[PDB]
Amino acid sequence: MERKISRIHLVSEPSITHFLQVSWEKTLESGFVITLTDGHSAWTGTVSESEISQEADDMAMEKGKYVGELRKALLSVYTFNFSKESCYFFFEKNLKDVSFRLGSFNLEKVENPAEVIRELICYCLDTIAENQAKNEHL
Amino acid sequence: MEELEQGLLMQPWAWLQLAENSLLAKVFITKQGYALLVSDLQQVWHEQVDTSVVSQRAKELNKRLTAPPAAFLCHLDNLLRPLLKDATFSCDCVADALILRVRSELSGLPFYWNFHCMLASPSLVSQHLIRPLMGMSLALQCQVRELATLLHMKDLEIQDYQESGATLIRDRLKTEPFEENSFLEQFMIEKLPEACSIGDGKPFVMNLQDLYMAVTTQ
């Protein structure tokens, strides 16, 4: 499905906020693609499960909350820390008596940094289609 | 001496977090571990493991447990009063081994911990589930005799004050004289058998918990 920008604010770098334009393919553990940008350089990462899906199978997969954890992890909440140099996005999960890690998003970078920005401009167009003109219709 | 098992013994017979019939699982978490005596009155479990040995014992009993060892002490210490240790749990009094796991499936990452109660040696079985049970039987009968000396004239006073002045007007609530010797046969075989529902020693915990607090020394 189309790469939709889910803007996220890093606790390490809240000034230039990131944009987890995550094109999740029907799941977050058996095939998904995340294109992360800070609005300046686009780490369009056609990511696979060879980098995150093992996070499930290596660190006590219990029986409480995982889908919601990763779902809220792709929006603006944990210590979102995307490494600009390594194109790798990580954050720490906090809860009772133990603070696990959740995401090891190694979000690759394409040569075009304006891809997510131009997509965000198509987004300014439809978001722009979000109040007054079809206000005028209805 | 031996404040861990002594605290276990002085800990009232308490209901551990269970989803089935209540067992004699009076957990007493100490500052240096715990002595856990779980009993269904069909088998004896004596989990007297300190907070240090239990950490390595979980590595050989728990299927997958990678948790901080320091956090284990804090996780256990809240169960000093047998009310909560982590939702609720359930002792497994189905076979020779008892399990305290509640299983769901969401691939999540909460904090989960379980108690693994090993088999108790016959010496411990005697010292915790026959000798103490005999002790509470003696205590209950000592409670019963001072009642019996108080059960022969007080139960007749109501009948003595029944018609002697202010004759009864509510005849629907009349009662018969009561005595300990009469109760030995007037109720044991007439109405008791219909209400005699015992099972595998189930009637133990509803009246031997508040009393079991006064065994602090032994």
Added chain:
Amino acid sequence: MEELEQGLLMQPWAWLQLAENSLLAKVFITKQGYALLVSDLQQVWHEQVDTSVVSQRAKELNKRLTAPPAAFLCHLDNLLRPLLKEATFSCDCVADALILRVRSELSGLPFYWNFHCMLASPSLVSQHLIRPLMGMSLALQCQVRELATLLHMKDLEIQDYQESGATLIRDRLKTEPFEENSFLEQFMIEKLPEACSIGDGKPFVMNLQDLYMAVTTQ
């Protein structure tokens, strides 16, 4: 088999004649059958076992002669039939090893006898000899409160303390109305040594036999 042992409630408990430590033993008055249990408060051996695990030590003193296994069970309980219906035995809790420190004398001539029992199997120690063991507490667990609170609802017609006089009941043996809460803290101060050392068992046995003939007959 079950028809033979279902009648076990024919008679109340019989006290072990040691007069030193409160030990509970059962007596079975039935032809072609017996039920002996040793409860020395250190290792309670339940003799209701099989011939598999016992057959490795019980044949270390026989070379070319054999005796029936039922001979011993149909001996002790048979000799007690025409005797009951200074007998002092000693069994300290410290000596875990099976070298009995017994100073018993009955007829002058010593007779070799001891608590000949191996390790108690977990299945047979609690799954079949506790339901009749809890029956003695059934006359308590379901009736301690029935005797305690009975002074309360029987005081309704005794509420004439204003319209007929101003005097109490007797005020000569008058103690507190013995209830559940009366015996809670009472165990702390006076019954604490009883929990420490049970005593001899005389208040523990004869004091429950009057409540045991029909406790769970039906």
